[PDB]
Design a protein around this ligand. Structure first.
Ligand SMILES: Nc1ncnc2c1ncn2[C@@H]1O[C@H](COP(=O)(O)OP(=O)(O)O)[C@@H](O)[C@H]1O
Length: 576
């Protein structure tokens, strides 16, 4: 390579080694043809994250100008903005540019699926509607059935330099919404407000209710993110859309086109066909198995027919065929002879083919990871979970956890959004439904497992927002205990001035109040009454909690009726 390049590479090596995770970086470099499979295997055998990184950078140092740029592009693709900035210095000569790769990563837009086929006519129709917004507020709605590929479409539509530069110089921000209640949407809006004001030029505290969050979003889009697009993935209710109605440009996906009825301004719509066509389905298969479409066996056309146009199902089956290469007849027959049993029968969706594909794929998991996949049945819809949460669940180190999860990801059984060093894992809604149904009888014990494992790494009072899993536990500790039916632990957590103080000072009272209401049904008569004590203490004082300067929770508790357990706890602390 160039002298600029090497000096620059050699110069930033320790910075690179320190921070980069190599797995998805190498996936890109392999695809670009600048890194071999044995080179990957040699890197993956290094015992640690940094030694994997050291090994790779050593290999790249003995490599041409194009590898540097490929590696540069993997860094942007994977969210290593600041490390790539240091490599920009030494960049040699060699619709998706570096600009697109950085803008989308910055906005948290999902990377392309493991295997990806173009859908040009749909992508162009979305881009055409987005180009009609002309720097003014408006709504573009992508609508169609669950799993038809809307979110992949929305991400591809913005994966374009001219559109981005010409229409949205302020960038794009992706919000994963899904089906939400008020406190669920609030959690999403709080996280969004944090993302949109990183340099902290506006309030350090979170919005504490939907009205405040709507207002803060309005200010951040006006003052920080003018001429930008907000992308809302999977909106179920028109009331949710009103929370975002703040003079913005919005692209959203939905199963229900009527979600835009409570909202005003320019409205454009792109219907997505319920089924991927035969040829595109075959193309997905061919890319998974690495052959030309015309060289596919005869079973391929039958398999596509059995997949009923669902790209998730086609992908599950394609990954199986890649993994077990001469079994086309065997897997066609399993798909035709459907053995899986849906209890929660009907839906807004035909599960038949997805259930069977999931069932076959899960069955073929090598035996020492089958139980790990079962554990993921406790993952919720529309929650992207940080690696650390699974380290805790499995008592394993980060490298080992991430390796196991990549095996699921590579089989389309799991998804991973990468922003540089931060890794977050999620399931498609339809996969949550499958696991919940498959493992229904284990679900309580799995929820109990996470609480048991959490209690060896943390204490509730030990939780701090610098750590990557912090908000997961504030948001979902009570949820998991209640799902585990662990009434004792739930009471010990929630019937606590300390917990109220800690949680309200971060996120305010609203979710807490909802958790008291939602989980009260698992409690005996005695604890149910104390639940109500705490709930009314929070509702009474709800305007005060989480607002700086923070109220004295002991003083507030001493204003509760003397029969109240809140008062009795407040009395003890006052003395102590
Ligand atoms: N263009 C595409 N090429 C390859 N796979 C796709 C494509 N679109 C969707 N998929 C597959 O289908 C799954 C579901 O797509 P997604 O966009 O999440 O659907 P929806 O948002 O409509 O529920 C993805 O995780 C991926 O496996």
């Amino acid at each position: 390579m160039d002298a600029k390049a090497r000096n620059c590479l050699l110069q930033h090596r320790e910075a690179l080694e320190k921070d980069i995770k190599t797995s998805y970086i190498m996936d890109h470099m392999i695809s670009d043809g600048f890194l071999t499979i044995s080179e990957e295997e040699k890197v993956r055998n290094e015992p640690t994250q940094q030694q994997r990184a050291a090994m790779l950078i050593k290999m790249i140092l003995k490599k041409d100008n194009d590898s540097y740029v490929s590696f540069y592009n993997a860094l942007l693709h994977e969210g290593y903005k600041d490390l790539a900035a240091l490599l920009h210095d030494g960049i040699p000569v060699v619709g998706i540019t570096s600009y697109v790769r950085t803008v989308l990563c910055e906005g948290g837009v999902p990377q392309r699926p493991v295997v990806f086929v173009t859908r040009k006519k749909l992508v162009n129709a979305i881009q055409q509607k987005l180009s009609k917004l002309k720097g003014e507020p408006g709504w573009v709605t992508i609508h169609g059935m669950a799993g038809c590929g809307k979110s992949v479409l929305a991400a591809e539509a913005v994966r374009d330099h001219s559109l981005l530069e010409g229409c949205f110089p302020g960038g794009v921000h992706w919000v994963s919404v899904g089906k939400q209640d008020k406190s669920g949407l609030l959690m999403k809006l709080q996280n969004l407000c944090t993302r949109l004001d990183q340099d902290e030029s506006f309030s350090q505290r979170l919005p504490l209710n939907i009205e405040e969050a709507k207002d803060r979003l309005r200010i951040l889009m006006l003052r920080k993110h003018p001429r930008s697009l907000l992308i809302l993935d999977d909106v179920w209710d028109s009331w949710v859309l009103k929370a975002f109605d703040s003079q913005c440009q919005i692209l959203l996906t939905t199963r229900d086109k009527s979600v835009t009825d409570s909202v005003m301004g320019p409205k454009y719509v792109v219907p997505v066909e319920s089924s991927l066509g035969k040829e595109k389905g075959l193309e997905i298969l061919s890319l998974f198995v690495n052959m030309k479409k015309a060289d596919l066996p005869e079973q391929a056309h039958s398999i596509i027919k059995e997949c009923k146009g669902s790209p998730l199902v086609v992908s599950l089956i394609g990954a199986l065929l890649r993994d077990f290469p001469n079994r086309w007849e065997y897997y066609l027959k399993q798909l035709q002879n459907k053995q899986f049993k849906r209890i929660r029968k009907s839906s807004s969706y035909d599960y038949e083919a997805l259930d069977e594909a999931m069932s076959i794929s899960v069955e073929m998991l090598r035996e020492d990871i089958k139980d790990y996949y079962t554990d993921l049945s406790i993952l919720q819809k529309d929650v992207k979970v940080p690696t650390k949460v699974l380290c805790i669940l499995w008592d394993m180190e980060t490298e080992e956890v991430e390796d196991i999860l990549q095996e699921f990801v590579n089989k389309s059984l799991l998804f991973c959004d990468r922003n540089g060093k931060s890794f977050r894992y999620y399931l498609h809604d339809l996969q949550v439904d499958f696991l919940t149904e498959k493992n229904c009888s284990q679900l309580q014990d799995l929820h109990k497992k996470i609480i048991t494992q959490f209690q060896r790494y943390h204490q509730p009072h030990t939780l701090s927002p610098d750590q990557e899993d912090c908000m997961y536990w504030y948001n979902f500790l009570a949820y998991h205990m209640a799902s585990a039916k662990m009434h004792k632990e739930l009471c010990a957590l929630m019937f606590s001035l300390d917990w109220i103080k800690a949680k309200t000072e971060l996120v305010g009272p609203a979710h807490l109040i909802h958790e008291f209401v939602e989980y009260r049904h698992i409690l005996d008569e005695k604890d149910c009454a104390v639940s109500e004590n705490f709930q009314e203490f929070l509702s009474l004082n709800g305007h005060l909690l989480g607002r700086q300067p923070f109220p004295n929770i002991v003083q507030l508790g001493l204003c509760e009726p003397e029969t109240s357990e809140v008062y009795q706890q407040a009395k003890l602390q006052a003395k102590q």
